[PDB]
Amino acid sequence: EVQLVESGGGLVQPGGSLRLSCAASGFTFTDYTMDWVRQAPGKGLEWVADVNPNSGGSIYNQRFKGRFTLSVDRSKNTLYLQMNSLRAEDTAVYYCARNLGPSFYFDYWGQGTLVTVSSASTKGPSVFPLAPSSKSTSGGTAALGCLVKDYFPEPVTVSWNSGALTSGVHTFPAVLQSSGLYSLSSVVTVPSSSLGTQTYICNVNHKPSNTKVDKKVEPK
């Protein structure tokens, strides 16, 4: 399997700098050309730069020349994107990609990582338990959950019981409040409001603030 795994995303202040990483595996690194491509929130795709892994020779789209630098580390099959003097319009999901020779279509892409360029500061979520209740639902099953309140920026990931609980879990997309912070919820469908010998812990990972919270959910 070809895998491109990017990391290094998060929040950066305007004028600030940020370095992304793309770890390549499953193919011969030096055989291909490595690319960056970006997507502004709700906009099209924009090719950013490419680098031949053999020479370190890079070519950049004209809006990023002198501002962005690509480098590779051949010995650990990894590609970098060093971004400098960032501004608000640089806020985007950044993908690494792969192409072959002179034709720059992209067969393999990384998962994408969000770079947010903003005046605001990072904020880990306040996580609250949503106690199990039969009367909470319209459809006659019981539910419990976690309210993930007041964090910045996106993304947050949620799992339950460190990934052991997947059935009946629904994690809702975040709302952006007027305060400028995000809130989301994750709900678990359960038999009743009595939990017996079941444990329910929601694991909330907020990579941008280096914060994880694992919240225990119990009856009122």
Partner: protein, 210 residues
Amino acid sequence: DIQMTQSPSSLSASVGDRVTITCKASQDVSIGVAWYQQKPGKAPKLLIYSASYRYTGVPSRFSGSGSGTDFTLTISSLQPEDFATYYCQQYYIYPYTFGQGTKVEIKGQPKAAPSVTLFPPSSEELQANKATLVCLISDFYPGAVTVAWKADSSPVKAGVETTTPSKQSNNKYAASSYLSLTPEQWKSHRSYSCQVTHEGSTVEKTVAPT
């Protein structure tokens, strides 16, 4: 610069329809054109290269045709999972310009009324002198809802935040609404209500203090 101009900008179409997306290049680009599919929050997936060649594992219902300035992507038999944004791209000439995308959205699937789940503020939240009501809305189609909140019987405007609806993995939709209160507001009413309207019908949930 080199322009790639897709048409139409969006399409509503039904399961089993033939769909034709066009992409016009600003200059002759031969067959140096690719098509990609992208779903919300996921990387684009290569569909077509050299204008007409299916990428490995791409289903045969996707076809590309054309050369010069006029290119086309055809989906002969639209299946429920084909709904996404489609990008054309000319890939020979710097800076390898993408079209702006064509959003193919679903229409004519079975209508479904929303399930509504409402939680009161947690005892932990209240002790931090905050209060949030949480109204979770799922399993509805089409993807539109409006939400109103009531304190007792009175409409409450301030402190409501509601998401835009979004597609679940089952092609129905989800949305959330949040009401921010002070603990005194929460405690001073007999109950609060989340009321979710979808296609002229309402599902309401009420909750009470303690």
